[PDB]
Amino acid sequence: SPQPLEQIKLSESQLSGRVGMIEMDLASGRTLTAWRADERFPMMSTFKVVLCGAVLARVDAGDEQLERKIHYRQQDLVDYSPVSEKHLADGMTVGELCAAAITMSDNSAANLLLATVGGPAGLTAFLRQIGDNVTRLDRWETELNEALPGDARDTTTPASMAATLRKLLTSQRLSARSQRQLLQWMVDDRVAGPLIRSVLPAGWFIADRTGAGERGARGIVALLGPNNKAERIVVIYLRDTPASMAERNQQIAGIGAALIEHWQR
Ligand SMILES: OC[C@H]1O[C@H](O[C@H]2[C@H](O)[C@@H](O)[C@H](OCCCCCCC3CCCCC3)O[C@@H]2CO)[C@H](O)[C@@H](O)[C@@H]1O
Ligand SMILES: *C(=O)/C=C/N[C@@H](C(=O)O)[C@](C)(COC(=O)CCCC(=O)O)S(=O)O
């Protein structure tokens, strides 16, 4: 592989789209690679990690319990609800909803949780409270994935998203147990986790949440590192490319390969 930045550039040339990327040490926040890190990108389903961070904050404050069962109706469901469709009769716990949102990208689960934190405005207020003044949620699932050009709704920047994920996982803003829970949800991703492991060299840790949207929007927020450690946050977004889903996946994987091959920086 070329160096990471050279590969990121190559991916833009090949996609005819914008890539936004940051590689950050999880423990310290050291930024190693940054490319369009201050430009806006649609979050897509990656917002689900911040959503569950807001849920966990409520749990820590005693205003929520992960055990609490929510009993929803079919009229409450949106597109792609693989877990939530199964539990119309018996409901799902708040924690089960988080797991379905993060590990399966269950959209109805994300919307039920969104309501509990005061909707998109409530989540945005949470982000401002942890000092993210850039990331914003404006819409519910599934409309938040629309990715219109020039539209600032439902966007983050690589730098903001990385800093916010670090705050949630490590800053002791969340309780120790809640930090551990958010991490485990990302470790348990079923959408991309097992596939990524299948192509990672032995010894490499992965945890992740992915997203996809219109106009080629694609993204991943991930923890990655050798020696089976979550050494770094890697955030990659793509926007405004006409490329196939397969090609977008391959280009992100190629950036990952360049990181792996040239890890010691
Ligand atoms: O010298 C480093 C390594 O080089 C190769 O590993 C390859 C691997 O065989 C390939 O499957 C992967 O593709 C990249 C797959 C990455 C998957 C997505 C990564 C995510 C992770 C977090 C966010 C960014 C994207 O590249 C690495 C590095 O060349 C060798 O196979 C391996 O034995 C060796 O230890
Ligand atoms: C979040 O990123 C959602 C992506 N698109 C979904 C949506 O708009 O609700 C779809 C329903 C596709 O969803 C999936 O394939 C699940 C995995 C999405 C992910 O990467 O997390 S839409 O039909 O594209």
Numbering used by the authors: 26 to 238, 240 to 252, 254 to 292
Direct quotes from the study:
Bacteria harboring β-lactamase enzymes [E.C. 3.5.2.6] pose a significant threat to public health. Sulbactam, tazobactam and clavulanic acid are mechanism-based inactivators as they share similarities with the β-lactam structure, the normal substrate for β-lactamases. Similar to a substrate, these inhibitors can, after acylation at catalytic residue S70, undergo several inhibitory reaction pathways including fragmentation in the active site and covalently cross-linking at S130.
In 2008, the K234R mutation was first identified in a clinical isolate harboring the SHV enzyme (SHV-56) which was found to be an IR β-lactamase and subsequently observed in two additional IR variants: SHV-72 and SHV-84. Previously, we determined the structure of the 1.08 Å IR apo K234R SHV variant. Most importantly, the C2 carboxylate participated in hydrogen bonding with R244, R234, T235 and both S130 conformations. The R234 residue also adopts two conformations, as in the apo K234R SHV structure. In addition, we also observed two conformations for residue S130 with 35/65% occupancy. The residues with increased temperature factors are predominantly located in the Ω-loop which encompasses residues 164–179.
